Amino acid sequence: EHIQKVAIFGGTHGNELTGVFLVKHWLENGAEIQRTGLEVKPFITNPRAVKKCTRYIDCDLNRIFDLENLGKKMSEDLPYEVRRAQEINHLFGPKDSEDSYDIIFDLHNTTSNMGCTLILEDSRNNFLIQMFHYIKTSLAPLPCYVYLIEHPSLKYATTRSIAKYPVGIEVGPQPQGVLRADILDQMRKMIKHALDFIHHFNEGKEFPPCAIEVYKIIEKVDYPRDENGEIAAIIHPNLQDQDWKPLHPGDPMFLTLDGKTIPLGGDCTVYPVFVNEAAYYEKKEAFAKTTKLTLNAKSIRC
Amino acid sequence: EHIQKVAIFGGTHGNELTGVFLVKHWLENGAEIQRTGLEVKPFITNPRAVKKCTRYIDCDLNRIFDLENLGKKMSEDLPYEVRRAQEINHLFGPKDSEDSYDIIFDLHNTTSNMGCTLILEDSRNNFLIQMFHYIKTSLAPLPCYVYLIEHPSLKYATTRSIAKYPVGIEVGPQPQGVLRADILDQMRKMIKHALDFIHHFNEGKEFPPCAIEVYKIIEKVDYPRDENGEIAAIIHPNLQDQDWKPLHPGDPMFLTLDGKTIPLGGDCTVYPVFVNEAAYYEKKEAFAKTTKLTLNAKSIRC
Numbered sequence: 031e032h033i034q035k036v037a038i039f040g041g042t043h044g045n046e047l048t049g050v051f052l053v054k055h056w057l058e059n060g061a062e063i064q065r066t067g068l069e070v071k072p073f074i075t076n077p078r079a080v081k082k083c084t085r086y087i088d089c090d091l092n093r094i095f096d097l098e099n100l101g102k103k104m105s106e107d108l109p110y111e112v113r114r115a116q117e118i119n120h121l122f123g124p125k126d127s128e129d130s131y132d133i134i135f136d137l138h139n140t141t142s143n144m145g146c147t148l149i150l151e152d153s154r155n156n157f158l159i160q161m162f163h164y165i166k167t168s169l170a171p172l173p174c175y176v177y178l179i180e181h182p183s184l185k186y187a188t189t190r191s192i193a194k195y196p197v198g199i200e201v202g203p204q205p206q207g208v209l210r211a212d213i214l215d216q217m218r219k220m221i222k223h224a225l226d227f228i229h230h231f232n233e234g235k236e237f238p239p240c241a242i243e244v245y246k247i248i249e250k251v252d253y254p255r256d257e258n259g260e261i262a263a264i265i266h267p268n269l270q271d272q273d274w275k276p277l278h279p280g281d282p283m284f285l286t287l288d289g290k291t292i293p294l295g296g297d298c299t300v301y302p303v304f305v306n307e308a309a310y311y312e313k314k315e316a317f318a319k320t321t322k323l324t325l326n327a328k329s330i331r332c
Numbered sequence: 333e334h335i336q337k338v339a340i341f342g343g344t345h346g347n348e349l350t351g352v353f354l355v356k357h358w359l360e361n362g363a364e365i366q367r368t369g370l371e372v373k374p375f376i377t378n379p380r381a382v383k384k385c386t387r388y389i390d391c392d393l394n395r396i397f398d399l400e401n402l403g404k405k406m407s408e409d410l411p412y413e414v415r416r417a418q419e420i421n422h423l424f425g426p427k428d429s430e431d432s433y434d435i436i437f438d439l440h441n442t443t444s445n446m447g448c449t450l451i452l453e454d455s456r457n458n459f460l461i462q463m464f465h466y467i468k469t470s471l472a473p474l475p476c477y478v479y480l481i482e483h484p485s486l487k488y489a490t491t492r493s494i495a496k497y498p499v500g501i502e503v504g505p506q507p508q509g510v511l512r513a514d515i516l517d518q519m520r521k522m523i524k525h526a527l528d529f530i531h532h533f534n535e536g537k538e539f540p541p542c543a544i545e546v547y548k549i550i551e552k553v554d555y556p557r558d559e560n561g562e563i564a565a566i567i568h569p570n571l572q573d574q575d576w577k578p579l580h581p582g583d584p585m586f587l588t589l590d591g592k593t594i595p596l597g598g599d600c601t602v603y604p605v606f607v608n609e610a611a612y613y614e615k616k617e618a619f620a621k622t623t624k625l626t627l628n629a630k631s632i633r634c
């Protein structure tokens with residue numbers, strides 16, 4: 031097919047505000063993002079987790095947009111976010127369906143020092159790459175990065191995963207529960223400018239094939255825990271606020287409260303991402319180790 | 333008068349962690365905090381809120397160490413905090429009584445870029461002013477700004493106020509539930525000078541008269557609201573991260589998504605503190621407006 035329905039989701043993580051704020055307005059006086067040809071839909075996904083201003087109320091709405099969850103049946107009892115992903119399947123989905131959106135945006139914010147981050151789901155996404163390639167470009171001088179989740183497994187449950195062509199937008203760093211006017215713009219640069227690439231492409235303009243060499247999630251790093259339970263050695267003052275950068279074998283990683291360091295394994299370079307992210311602390315996670323692995327595509331016309 | 337009982341409270345609020353980690357580490361080895369001729373019991377105040385990375389369970393434990401709560405007898409219906417408060421007032425109390433603990437340091441991290449902050453409740457009171465001075469100088473050459481809560485009423489409700497000499501230790505920026513090697517180091521050093529301090533004083537060190545620059549809250553400034561009540565504007569950009577620095581009448585104080593700027597007002601200089609604190613949306617306030625006033629202490633000697 032072609033294009034059609036477009037969405038901007040804000041509120042999947044209720045206490046990620048610069049990703050959320052804007053939407054509340056684009057329901058109030060949405061004139062701020064509607065163009066002369068293209069069609070974009072702004073929607074707040076987890077209203078209740080927004081109001082409290084809290085990651086979630088029953089379960090991560092961001093890990094339940096798939097069979098596994100979507101498929102479960104009607105019980106006013108069920109965990110709030112479930113029934114929510116379900117219904118969400120009617121407005122912009124269902125997922126894997128046909129009438130369901132092809133361009134939705136799942137806006138977020140992190141605590142790790144990451145700056146502009148576009149998230150790619152499957153690698154074989156010729157288009158998405160032209161875009162993830164046409165965003166990085168339309169961005170300079172302000173830095174932008176592409177994160178890839180290559181599930182060999184081959185299955186996603188994300189909120190944005192209802193659309194033909196999903197796109198994750200994340201901006202760091204913005205403490206959960208806070209709203210920095212700076213982050214409310216450290217990112218406006220692709221949206222209303224993306225709402226563009228999702229129109230202009232139509233004219234059938236073409237660019238040479240594509241190969242964004244991204245950083246791909248390959249293995250999450252654990253927190254060196256003491257004994258009884260509690261931590262032992264935390265993110266070192268050298269890795270801190272160093273996402274997307276190399277971490278060779280000497281590079282410190284974890285610093286113990288008694289003063290010691292704990293360096294990197296192997297001898298191959300990596301660019302840690304999601305360094306010291308608030309959420310995932312209950313997961314005993316310090317960061318995701320990444321190899322700046324490659325991504326070639328193919329040219330595209332409309 | 334010679335000091336004997338000294339407790340370092342941490343985990344007071346659940347998001348804040350530098351103290352949960354520090355306290356615990358000492359609870360296993362206070363060598364760094366033990367002093368000759370003193371007793372320093374590190375203690376976690378809100379065990380539970382620490383487990384559900386909440387700011388708490390029922391309500392804040394930094395607002396109930398007063399006669400209304402203190403006048404309640406222990407029970408089931410009695411909510412968690414009210415219950416725990418007592419146990420601390422039992423353990424480190426009863427209150428305003430000499431029967432209780434001498435000095436208590438309670439640690440707190442903030443999302444505002446404010447660095448090393450000492451919190452004093454009442455100014456006129458020569459005892460606890462020299463201490464802060466010794467810290468300002470011993471912790472140098474990094475700001476170690478001091479914040480005041482002058483209550484002409486002459487009253488306080490901080491978990492730390494059980495002590496005959498309450499001392500607040502706040503440090504930012506270190507997101508809620510995300511511990512940074514660095515932040516933990518500033519506080520680590522603040523505590524040193526403070527513990528050691530009591531040590532040479534206890535061992536009769538004489539001290540000459542001194543004075544300290546401080547900031548008094550003079551107007552909790554709020555974020556603009558909406559038609560009904562929603563947050564219209566927000567903290568301004570150029571102000572973000574400028575806690576403690578000078579704010580004149582016509583300088584940017586806020587902003588609105590339609591690019592609009594809202595100015596300060598009044599006819600004098602103010603020093604915004606707690607500029608964009610995560611808990612402030614909840615404790616309401618875009619930032620605290622304060623005056624820099626001088627406190628002059630008399631020379632003390634044990």
Ligand SMILES: [Zn+2]
Nearest residue numbers: 043046138139
């Ligand atoms: Zn998120």
Ligand SMILES: [Zn+2]
Nearest residue numbers: 345348440441
């Ligand atoms: Zn606190």
